[model samples]
Target: RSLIVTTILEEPYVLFKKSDKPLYGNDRFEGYCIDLLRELSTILGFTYEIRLVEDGKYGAQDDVNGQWNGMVRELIDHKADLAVAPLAITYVREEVIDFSKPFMTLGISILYRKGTPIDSADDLAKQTKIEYGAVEDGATMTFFKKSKISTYDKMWAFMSSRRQSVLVKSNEEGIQRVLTSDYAFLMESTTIEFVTQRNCNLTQIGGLIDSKGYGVGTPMGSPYRDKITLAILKLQEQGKLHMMKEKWWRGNGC
Candidate 1:
């Protein structure tokens, strides 16, 4: 029996490759998670089917209906046995599913075009008016609320205000907006690092807004959790996980 693995095809984590000849199965994709998955499968001697999340979101809860969507929903609904992407290990998500010990660590950050007029959230908030945003209804938005910093609070009000239409649905769109307009895209620092490494003109400003980890998520009571967790710990102990991250995020620089 094979485990069904669900993930989002995000950069430096899971990405499709252009091939001159036909590519099949896992060969069709590559990245940190792709290699990591291979290592885990080899360690545990298990097979998996890698499928992209239908909605293209990591996961989000509907505030009113209490419904879950994206990868988390896939796990809760038993559509996938594991989620192996840059899935944030959040308190809310943990309530519904179990996350392996963090495979990667990161934090919220400001992504902006190089030479853009901003150094940090402090700079952004101080501006009487500026175009800055995050993925709409994303974990980053919640990060602002929990920040308890005056600058973040002010920044949140401006971004979330009715007069502003700064929220985007996806990080790609938000990054594009940053390039085309005077906008700053708030996102995970790991992704900001990945994107900046590829696009020199785009850079992450300031220190991390908040620290978090990316973990492999399984169903609420998955027996596989212990096995996968042990595998991750072993990989970390061998420094293989760090090696994989270096290969994908830094070695593949443009």
Candidate 2:
């Protein structure tokens, strides 16, 4: 048996509540990851417990400071066992953890305000007056801030060199800011169904800006590494992964 660690931050991917009764999991956590976990546990012959990541930082900070490991600290410090989420596979992460084969591909795209006259990346870069940013907890914004693209100190630096700063707690907030403000744009990916399904005023403005893959990760040296990889391979061979993309999302990235 294993204790599955995940974030309460990402919605429909993971969520938390004070109670497990009244089907709380269905409202907050029902989706691909949750379903997969249930099936995998049954197949592996190990029952598991779901533990929420209880880090202090809300969004971007949690990711940059490696909240996954900190959450796993519970498991590592002998509080739990393993991590199973849509954790991105990265070199730094690999140093402290082991990841299964990538199950999904993702990248960054600009969610421009509807009336901004920003037609593309070139337009956004050339216009120069609008303020831009991303949701606090997202990885793309963190990457944009740290990437070699610009010299701005905060989230809006590369997207804008002057005039304003953007702040938000989640992708929903960032996207909402774009819809309401003519001078703001929220950066995110091409894969989210919630953003697309709502038919919001904002939309991805370009092709994928950067690409990365998602993996299921375990604490470094965990015996579950091979087991998780086997699950990923089995799912891939069955075409279930592609079916999931078709079922839940639209647009070009899937």
Candidate 3:
């Protein structure tokens, strides 16, 4: 059966081309997850159609209605058969979807301009002089929903407070805000690595804020779970998964 694979369009994970020359179907895109899906298709003997999440969010739960949107919503509503991207595996998400073993490990970090004098989240919190932002409906945002540590809880309380709209719509926008203002963008470390490599003006500050993994997800109880998980495990055993990540992630050398 042909599966509808839902994902978000992001750098080094899912990138599009202008195509001065002719390109067709999936060939129009290239990235780590793109290649991973190709390998999984070859190994599992299944075909897939790649579709970007319409809302352009990784996925988040609504506080008011308790409804989920972004890629998770697509899967929950049976709009897609699988979700393959730099999607974080969280406890809240696991309750509604089945995720394969983590294909890649990462954590939250701060993305900022190169000259920013901050080393870590703690430093950012200590300074009220600079503004920091995060995507409102992102995994990192939910990670801070409750205070894991006293200081961390205080930081969350400050961020979630109704000051200005410190929340952003996307990573690219947040990065831009950092570039233009006295701002730091909190995001996944892997993405910060990818983006900083491409743009020297940006850099990640300090160590990871929190650790997590990226997973291939299926709707709860989907039949393809075992088959896809085994395929990913095989690729990992052969080192293809790591190799693919290196190929796309490193980019134009930086």
Candidate 4:
């Protein structure tokens, strides 16, 4: 039997492949998650149809209404059976959706302009001369808002102070601000690699603020999680995950 898998597009995760001729269906896409789904299908013996997410937003909670939106809605509402995208596992998302053990571990880090480098989150927090923020609805903002850590708490205070001005609509916007003005964008470590690869002027500042990972998301009470977990771990032990990462992520040097 086949299932519907929903995903969002991002470099090295899911990207539209180019060809001299037209392509369709699963072949329309390429990148790490595509290869990941391929391996999963072979191992689990379950067929899948990949669907680019309709709303184009990653799974997130609307701050005003508190309604879960994007890929999370698709998974829970059964618009799709599995989400093979880069949905970060969180305490909130974990309860709403059953997540397999993390397939890829990553951390929230900083992206800033070069020349006058920011060494860490504390440095960013202490300075008012510079401004920084994440995508308004993302794990980075969620982490800062819910943080009990004092440093993050203070940082959150700064961000909340200028919520309208600092928070960006997208990672692309964040990157633009980083380049265009005196801004540092809080972003995920995994995604930072994609930008830092092709863009020479931008560089990552500081180690990860907090660690998290992308997990295969299924609906609550779905039976696929355990099987999916094993498949992921097995892939890890064989280093297929590592190899796939290289294939998709190792860009022509900047």
> Number of clashes in every candidate structure?
0, 3, 0, 0
Q: What does candidate 3's lDDT look like per residue over 1-254, in tens digits?
A: 88889988888888886688988877888888999889888988889888889988888899899999999889999999999998899999999998988889999988887875687888877766787768878788888775488656766777788335678888888888887888888899988988899888888898887788999989999988888889888999999988998898776657
Task: For candidate 4, give the lDDT.
Answer: 0.87
Shift in Å, residue 250, candidate 3: 2.2
TM-score-better candidate, 1 vs 4? 4
Model 4 lDDT tens row, 1-254: 69999998777789889999999899999989989989999999999899977887766787788888778888888999899978899998886888988888999999987777579999888889999898876778889988999889999999999999888877888888988888999999988988898788888898887889999999999889899999999999999999988887786659
- State TM-scores per candidate: 0.91, 0.74, 0.93, 0.92
Question: 150-183, model 2: which lDDT tens digit per residue?
Answer: 4333334554343244656556666666667664
Candidate 2, which segments miss by more than 4 Å at Cα? Answer: 15-21, 24-28, 56-80, 113-116, 126-128, 150-165, 183-193, 250-254
Give the residue spans of candidate 1 off by over 4 A: 145-148, 162-165, 251-254
Ordered list by lDDT, greatest first: 4, 1, 3, 2
| Top TM-score prediction, candidate number | 3
lDDT scores for all predictions?
0.85, 0.58, 0.85, 0.87
Top candidate (lDDT): 4
Residues 1-254 of candidate 1: C-alpha lDDT, one tens digit per residue:
49999988878788898789988877789989999899989998989889888888777787689898889899999999999988889998899999999998899999987786688889989885567878765578767655678998888888877324677777888888887877888899988988898788988999898889988999999988888899999999999999998898785676
Q: Model 3 compared with the native: what TM-score?
A: 0.93
- Pairs in steric clash, model 3: none
Cα lDDT for residue 167, model 2? 53
Candidate 3, overall lDDT?
Answer: 0.85
Q: Clashes in candidate 3: how many?
A: 0
